[PDB]
Design a protein around this ligand. Structure first.
Ligand SMILES: [Ca+2]
Ligand SMILES: [Ca+2]
Ligand SMILES: [Ca+2]
Ligand SMILES: [Ca+2]
Lengths: 148, 36
């Protein structure tokens, strides 16, 4: 069959109400940040907008009825390469600063078994370094991992 | 195969394939504790 019925939706629809305190039909940062608090998750202002943005299909800044449902539905398939981006980043992030430099990158290449020097790594960081800040940030790491 | 340009970066990207996870859906799991 591969489909959802009122029985399956009836459950998901219940989840929305749980997050919707004022029950206005749309989840905002104020209503979301609150629930997350009781759960034990105090994300950053930029992080919160990011989470909602992901599910934000109509780009309204809030989680609609179907927006929250479709989110759990995506679990079926599609959307996976992204995980490899976040996981890998953490796997390479030794100092846990959230940034990759020629020093760290060079160390990662060693684990793979690739003989590279400081002069060589320069060519790498130069590629990922889009903003030309002198280092490779997550924003750049995600684009380099998503693109060829 | 032989040589050309810096094909090292592509080595870090690995092949296409992995697990699925949303940047919010996980929160739902935390709801298992909070009353309904
Ligand atoms: Ca609401
Ligand atoms: Ca939306
Ligand atoms: Ca780092
Ligand atoms: Ca940069």
């Amino acid at each position: 069959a591969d489909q959802l019925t009122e029985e399956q939706i009836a459950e998901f629809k219940e989840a929305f109400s749980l997050f919707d305190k004022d029950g206005d039909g749309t989840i905002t940062t104020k209503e979301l940040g609150t629930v997350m608090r009781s759960l034990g998750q105090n994300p950053t202002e930029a992080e919160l907008q990011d989470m909602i943005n992901e599910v934000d299909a109509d780009g309204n800044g809030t989680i609609d009825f179907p927006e929250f449902l479709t989110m759990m539905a995506r679990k079926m398939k599609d959307t996976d390469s992204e995980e490899e981006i976040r996981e890998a980043f953490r796997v390479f992030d030794k100092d846990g600063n959230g940034y990759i430099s020629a020093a760290e990158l060079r160390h990662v290449m060693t684990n793979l078994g690739e003989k590279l020097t400081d002069e060589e790594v320069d060519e790498m960081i130069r590629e990922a370094d889009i903003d030309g800040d002198g280092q490779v940030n997550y924003e750049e790491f995600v684009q380099m991992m998503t693109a060829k | 195969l032989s040589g050309g340009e810096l094909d090292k970066w592509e080595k870090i990207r690995l092949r296409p394939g992995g697990k699925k996870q949303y940047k919010l859906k996980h929160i739902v799991w935390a709801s298992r504790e909070l009353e309904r």
